[PDB]
Design a protein around this ligand. Structure first.
Ligand code: NI
Length: 341
């Protein structure tokens, strides 16, 4: 049964609610983004209207085989009427195709559902600038002040400079980047651009990337692994055993691997600056964990909420324990007392 924080009151709508069977009263199912915890339950046998971005609808049709007649893609930044209710989709600064949803309820209430997002000051000049929000359904993934990490631009600078130095020292080094979902494509694209290479990958991953409307993508990626010196592998293979096994398959073209694991936050963020990050090394294999987040830091989240000034907040992440819920509620009250709303 569908939980309350996935239902939009005063509508027939749900958000990210595909794993509960037929939800009573639901006339349109919204999907914020193509990540498996959110699409859990969708397949080619789904027969109710799904509303989403264009990129999410390309993934639903090609990867999950949802039939076309049930996919309803909406443009961003554009007022649309769905089943008698005005909605707008906004860029969530998460993975490709990820949106926030503004719902203008028939009674005058305005609701923002963030989906998953990485808050940014640029969102203060979207269509949110123009009206009041009563209810905020908030991605609270990192809602605690211990969760710190650098900008995506600082992380990419580190990755490019590390890869360029290694390969210039040793032209026979291979670079490997781990992946297990969409998102974080700038890591491997930025590294392949500084090295003058296409990115090599499996047919299954190539197919996924071909759905993302990235400009000039045919110039940037390939299934011909022998032509590429930046390879993508499943995240599970990014360990010394898996990397050794991969290096054997490359037919003596290479004699060293430099590998990247984009994680979110890890506890080494509480001590080490991005500049000072070092790898784990075994023989001719080195592995860097890099803190590339597609979720708000605590400070980014707090800034957004203090600007928006919602009347009520409903968390959508960390909702399963009393301790997490009490912690989040204390920070919401702090923020409100500090800013005066
Ligand atoms: Ni996500």
């Amino acid at each position: 049964t569908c939980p309350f924080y996935k239902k939009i009151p005063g509508t027939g709508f749900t958000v990210d609610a595909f794993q509960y069977g037929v939800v009573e009263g639901c006339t349109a199912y919204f999907l914020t983004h193509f990540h498996s915890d959110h699409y859990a339950g969708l397949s080619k046998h789904f027969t109710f209207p799904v509303y989403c971005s264009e990129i999410t609808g390309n993934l639903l049709k090609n990867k999950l085989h949802v039939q076309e007649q049930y996919i309803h893609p909406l443009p961003l930044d554009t007022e649309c009427i769905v089943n008698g209710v005005k909605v707008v989709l906004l860029d969530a600064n998460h993975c490709p195709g990820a949106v926030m949803i503004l719902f203008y309820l028939p009674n005058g209430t305005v609701i923002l559902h963030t989906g998953d997002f990485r808050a940014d000051p640029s969102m203060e000049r979207s269509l949110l600038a123009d009206q009041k929000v009563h209810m905020l359904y908030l991605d609270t993934t990192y809602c605690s002040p211990e969760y710190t990490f650098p900008s995506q631009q600082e992380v990419i600078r580190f990755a490019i400079n590390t890869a360029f130095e290694a390969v210039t020292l040793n032209p026979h080094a291979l670079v490997v980047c781990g992946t297990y979902s969409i998102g974080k494509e700038k890591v491997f694209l930025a590294i392949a651009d500084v090295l003058g290479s296409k990115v090599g990958m499996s047919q299954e991953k190539y197919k996924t990337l071909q759905c993302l409307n990235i400009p000039e993508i045919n110039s940037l990626i390939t299934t011909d692994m022998c032509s590429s010196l930046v390879h993508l592998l499943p995240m599970m293979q990014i360990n010394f055993k898996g990397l050794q096994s991969h290096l054997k398959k490359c037919g003596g073209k290479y004699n060293q691997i430099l590998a990247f694991r984009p994680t979110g936050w890890t506890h080494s963020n509480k001590f080490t600056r991005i500049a000072d990050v070092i790898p784990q090394t075994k023989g001719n294999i080195s592995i860097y964990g890099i803190p590339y987040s597609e979720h708000s830091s605590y400070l980014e989240m707090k800034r957004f909420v203090q600007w928006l000034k919602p009347q009520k907040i409903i968390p959508t992440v960390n909702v399963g324990t009393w301790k997490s819920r009490s912690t989040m509620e204390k920070y919401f009250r702090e923020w409100k007392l500090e800013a005066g709303y």
